Design a protein around this ligand. Structure first.
Ligand code: FAD
Ligand code: FAD
Ligand code: NAD
Ligand code: NAD
Lengths: 22, 436, 437, 19
């Protein structure tokens, strides 16, 4: 689950189990 | 038709929603819709999305399309049997909804509760809704061009424009769509499907860097542009039209970058200009920033005049002053306006959404302030922007949400918008959406 | 105090009193409750800056009475306390009445439940509500950063107590400095200059503009009025921008950006008015972003059962556009209009409001409509003596604003001129209807 | 009786004869 910031817009990638993990 | 209790001035989605709401709250209510178009009120999204993909040769005449469940449905909101004749509207038992087709309200007198039609007749009202929408804008180059160019240019707004554009799509080998907004992209997808069926050519160009550059962030707009390009469409971003002229018997668009566009037909989808001709006569304030009629949180302009739909610039208490040109917003604004004219005082509370399907691979829902100018935080499942959700932030507060390729997840986004919680991280908030 | 009231007016002032009068006049038996955060009953502000200072009565500061233009004299209050009823008896008194909750500030407004909550925790339900909170004097930033001694020796002038404090200071101290060349600054400068000439003290007025009423009058008229104020006994200091205020040698010392220091014993700050829009945040009411105050429509209506009148009402005039007018006559007419609309008489802003100003014996003028110095102006004067004349304000070629300069009983003509936009080409003929000579 | 122009300001002086 890695992030990326472009100007005023940030994008977060999230894995299924990373989403599952509390 | 001399006097009517409820008068809706623009016959469309907002007017039909307001009439239905007025009938629901007030049994026996007499509602008159004055439509300049000869057609009965109908829903517009099928004209650009669903009527094109219908598997029926008689789709021009039937004007029917299949829904998600597969049931066939007409683009008209209700059959003509639902509407009552305007002549018998004052006498029909338990009220009804009547439409006066082919009549334009040219004069609006706020101080005498009166409206004058283009034919000279005058109608007095008690509660009035200005449910006029807008008219498609025109290019400066198209307007200053000759008469042949304007003969081969269409402003896609109504059923007649749909039938015309479909006839040209069958009989013409090249169509160019000006603009990359909602209507431009939807028409591009539909015409690309038709061209792949036939083998013809479809062009779309716009000044922005991608489709819906005013709505989606730049990466998402680029992804959507790639998708519509793979829909079988020639898409030309960063295009400013200088002039258009008939060369060799076909239209020739000259761009400010020097590139030429040889085409046989032009569809201009360059925005919507709200119909505010009645404001000049009625002395109604026009919003300078957003355009359209300025109204308060209750969609109210004057003591007996409400404005709903495309031409309404309203104040949403949660998010501020807005003008939203969308079908579901038209329905919600019509519902709220009908409630208010019935005698309620509800402000704009239930946020309205909108949807767009730019091919099988692009389908999204959006709620709240979805503006490309606002900063956003996007959380996507697993360069690929297949599934996910995008949050629009004003000051650490989620003012708008784009549900990207996720369905039945609108209640969660609506709940998030309803609260003004300043979320520290939005990944935890996105966890509410089981995007995977 | 009462749980429910039919008509609830928030704020005790000119607009609220005018609204209560209109409501009671066209709706006999109405129960009107005025909630004023100040202990004083409603009173008119103009005398505090013009008439109370020129009274021959030595004890005028205690009785607050003054003589108007005719032989009769009247108090500063709109009505005596016998006019108002108690809030306890308001629901029960026959044929209604008007009541004032003095010293109670509305801190919470809820529109959906039609409810307000006071500073003491009491809650009142209303059917119709007017927000006539007016405004509060703006403060100089250099005064704020100065400290506590300067703020103790600085006066924001809007209330009766401010008048009493400033009058006592003028009787006591020698030098007084007025900051701001607008309406109140100029009026107070003239009054204090007359008082100083009576006594033999020093009065100073400084402002960033080039002349008095620079935002209202054209530059030549501003210069003329500045000279008249200067000969009224005031050391007018134009083009003065305050950067620092600091106590030195037991006296206030204003330091300006151009490098001029002004030693004084007291400072009066008249640097504009901030509309009281605190109820908007808790009530979900829109605030105009380019004029301030509550945004209302042509009928002074904000929501279903909420109207706004006075200096806090940014309204829409059909003829002249969106406006916010901070003037006594505008407060009266907007309060009357708001009360009329509150009692189910939907009518927009039609009757244009005027304002007046008397900056000494030789400067007295009236104005109506859009009177703004940035607008193009055409002045027609009798016989550089700008003694008598008329000034027209134009948007494109239509007269939107007229200043009647030292000519009186000419308001009907200017009102008729503004009412019918005729796009006048030549302006000598329209000036001819004013018998300037 | 004469007319002067200072930017957007137009000053016109008229005597009694000009009514
Ligand atoms: C092809 C197309 C596809 C669309 N697809 C989508 C979609 O997928 N999703 C979405 O959310 N939105 C979509 N929209 C937008 C949505 O349809 C509109 O926002 C909605 O129809 C607005 O409703 P309205 O009643 O305010 O105005 P309109 O629907 O424009 O109705 C206005 C009517 O009033 C008439 N009128 C105007 N002035 C006068 C007058 N003075 N007197 C009498 N009559 C007058 C007009 O001629 C017209 O009949 C689409 C629009 C179009 C054109
Ligand atoms: C000294 C002075 C001289 C003036 N002279 C002239 C003149 O010669 N000519 C002219 O045209 N104009 C003049 N004006 C301007 C004019 O008097 C005002 O613009 C007008 O009186 C404003 O009336 P209003 O009722 O809107 O507000 P105000 O008169 O300010 O009344 C507002 C009231 O509401 C109260 N209030 C505020 N907030 C709350 C709250 N949250 N809850 C409850 N109560 C609240 C305030 O304390 C106050 O009692 C003068 C003003 C001043 C100060
Ligand atoms: N999916 C949906 O919700 C949907 C679908 C279709 C239509 N609509 C509605 O239909 C209406 C029409 O949409 P639209 O796409 O015409 O407008 P829009 O408001 O969606 O976007 C305006 C478009 O016109 C372009 N444009 C403006 N001036 C231009 C110029 N001089 N030259 C070239 N391009 C120019 C802009 O770049 C942009 O692409 C809108 O109200 C829209 O909301 C909505
Ligand atoms: N005759 C009348 O109509 C009349 C008379 C007195 C008061 N009033 C009202 O009373 C209120 C108070 O009057 P006011 O003169 O304070 O406001 P105003 O709006 O009349 O004028 C503002 C004045 O403050 C000055 N100012 C603003 N910011 C400043 C700063 N940072 N530093 C220095 N000076 C600054 C301006 O240059 C101008 O002189 C206003 O609402 C006014 O309309 C009206």
């Amino acid at each position: 689950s890695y992030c990326r910031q472009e100007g005023k817009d940030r994008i977060i990638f999230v894995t299924k189990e990373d989403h599952e993990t509390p | 038709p001399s006097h009517v209790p409820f008068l809706l001035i623009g016959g469309g989605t907002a007017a039909f929603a307001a009439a239905r709401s007025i009938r629901a709250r007030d049994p026996g209510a007499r509602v008159l819709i004055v439509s300049e178009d000869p057609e009965l009120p109908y829903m517009r999204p099928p004209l650009s999305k669903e009527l094109w993909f219908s598997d029926d040769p008689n789709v021009t005449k039937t004007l029917r399309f299949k829904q998600w469940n597969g049931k066939e449905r007409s683009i008209y909101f209700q059959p003509p049997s639902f509407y009552v004749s305007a002549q018998d509207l004052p006498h029909i038992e338990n009220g009804g909804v009547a439409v006066l087709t082919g009549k334009k309200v040219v004069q609006l007198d706020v101080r005498d509760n009166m409206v004058k039609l283009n034919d000279g007749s005058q109608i007095t009202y008690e509660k009035c809704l200005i449910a006029t929408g807008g008219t498609p804008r025109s290019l400066s180059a198209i307007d200053r061009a000759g008469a042949e160019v304007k003969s081969r240019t269409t402003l896609f707004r109504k059923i007649g424009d749909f039938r015309s554009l479909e006839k040209i799509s069958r009989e013409v080998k090249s169509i160019t769509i000006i603009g990359g907004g909602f209507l431009g992209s939807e028409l591009a997808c539909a015409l690309g499907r038709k061209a792949r069926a036939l083998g013809t050519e479809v062009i779309q160009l716009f000044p922005e860097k991608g489709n819906m550059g005013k709505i989606l962030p730049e990466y998402l707009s680029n992804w959507t542009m790639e998708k519509v390009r793979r829909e079988g469409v020639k898409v030309m971003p960063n295009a400013i039209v200088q002039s258009v002229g008939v060369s060799s018997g076909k239209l020739l668009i000259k761009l400010k970058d020097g590139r030429k566009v040889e085409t046989d037909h032009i569809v201009a989808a360059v925005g919507l200009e709200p119909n505010v001709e009645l404001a000049k006569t009625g002395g109604l304030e026009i919003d300078s920033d957003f355009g359209g009629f300025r109204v308060n949180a209750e969609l109210q302009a004057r003591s007996n005049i409400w404005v709903a739909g495309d031409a309404a610039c309203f104040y949403d208490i949660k998010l501020g002053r807005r003008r939203v040109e969308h079908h579901d917003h038209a329905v919600v604004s019509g519902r709220l306006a009908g409630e208010n004219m019935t005698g309620a005082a509800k402000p704009y509370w239930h946020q309205s959404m909108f949807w767009s399907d730019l091919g099988p691979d692009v389908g999204y829902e959006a709620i709240g302030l979805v503006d490309s100018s606002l900063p956003t935080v996007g959380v996507f499942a697993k360069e690929d922007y297949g599934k996910g959700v995008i949050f629009y932030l004003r000051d650490k507060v989620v003012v708008g949400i784009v549900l990207w390729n996720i369905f039945n997840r609108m209640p969660i986004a609506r709940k998030i918008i309803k609260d003004g919680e300043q979320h520290e991280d939005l990944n935890e908030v996105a966890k509410l959406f089981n995007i995977h």
